[PDB]
């Protein structure tokens, strides 16, 4: 009912959510009363297997995961989809004995709805997890920006620049690829701008620490001035990164 979120979520659930909305409108919402639904035994068994298989895989995902909200959050969705399958199975039994059965049609709507919504749940929970893996990269880079303040030698700065390399390269490849999977344009804009600001400020940071190391080893100059520019680059990078983390959590 609200937009699916990512291109994967939307392309999985969109055919289903479409077909359901129709089927409602039709039978339910008045309209095709005294109607007659054909025999669903075969399609409902196919669904029932696909829910075995989904709960199979998902229970592996659950026991074989590092993520702690993944562990706790997924299971309920297994309970939601199994329940909904149960309704679909009574639906098709009832319909076999009375094509015109109005309880059966209702079970089939709720059945279908609960399959859509439990799998929505399972996919949001999986996606939250994936977002957290980008947030970890973002948070560790923020942690490392905290430490720029302590570089004082050219050798520390060589070391600092070499650890912070991988980190920004990875953050950037993550946000870029994530941005592509997004379905809200106000959200892709935001991520990309932020990552652009970040990427362009990186050499500004390195230059500003070089300036700093260099007046802190030429025993004087204007060192206040050099340090506050460094502190401003670091705060601007931090703030952008904090926005990246925020906007990644947006779903609408």
């Amino acid at each position: 009912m609200p937009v699916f979120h990512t291109r994967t979520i939307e392309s999985i659930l969109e055919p289903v959510a479409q077909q359901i909305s129709h089927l409602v409108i039709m039978h339910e919402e008045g309209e095709v009363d005294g109607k007659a639904i054909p025999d669903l035994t075969a399609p409902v068994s196919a669904v029932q297997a696909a829910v075995s298989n989904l709960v199979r895989v998902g229970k592996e995902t659950v026991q074989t995961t590092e993520d702690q909200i993944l562990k706790r959050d997924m299971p309920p969705a297994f309970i939601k989809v199994e329940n909904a399958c149960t309704k679909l199975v009574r639906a098709a039994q009832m319909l076999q004995a009375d094509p015109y059965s109005v309880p059966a049609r209702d079970y089939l709507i709720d059945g279908s709805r609960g399959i859509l919504s439990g799998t929505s749940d399972l996919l949001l929970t999986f996606d939250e997890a994936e977002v957290r893996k980008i947030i970890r990269v973002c948070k560790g880079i923020l942690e490392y920006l905290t430490v720029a303040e302590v570089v004082e030698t050219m050798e520390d700065l060589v070391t600092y620049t070499k650890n912070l390399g991988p980190g920004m390269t990875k953050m950037a490849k993550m946000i870029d690829e994530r941005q592509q999977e997004l379905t809200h344009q106000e959200h892709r804009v935001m991520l990309v701008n932020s990552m652009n600001t970040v990427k362009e400020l990186l050499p500004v940071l390195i230059s500003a620490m070089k300036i700093f190391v260099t007046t802190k080893n030429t025993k004087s100059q204007g060192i206040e001035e050099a340090l506050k520019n460094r502190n401003f680059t670091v705060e601007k990078m931090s703030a952008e990164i904090n926005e990246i983390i925020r906007v990644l959590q947006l779903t609408s």
Partner: peptide
């Protein structure tokens, strides 16, 4: 990664083929 997202898809396919069958 992948195995979960295909299982979900296969389920969504199937639910949709089932609600096709029902007419709508």
């Amino acid at each position: 990664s992948r195995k979960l997202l295909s299982a979900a898809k296969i389920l969504a396919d199937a639910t949709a083929k089932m609600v096709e069958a029902a007419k709508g």
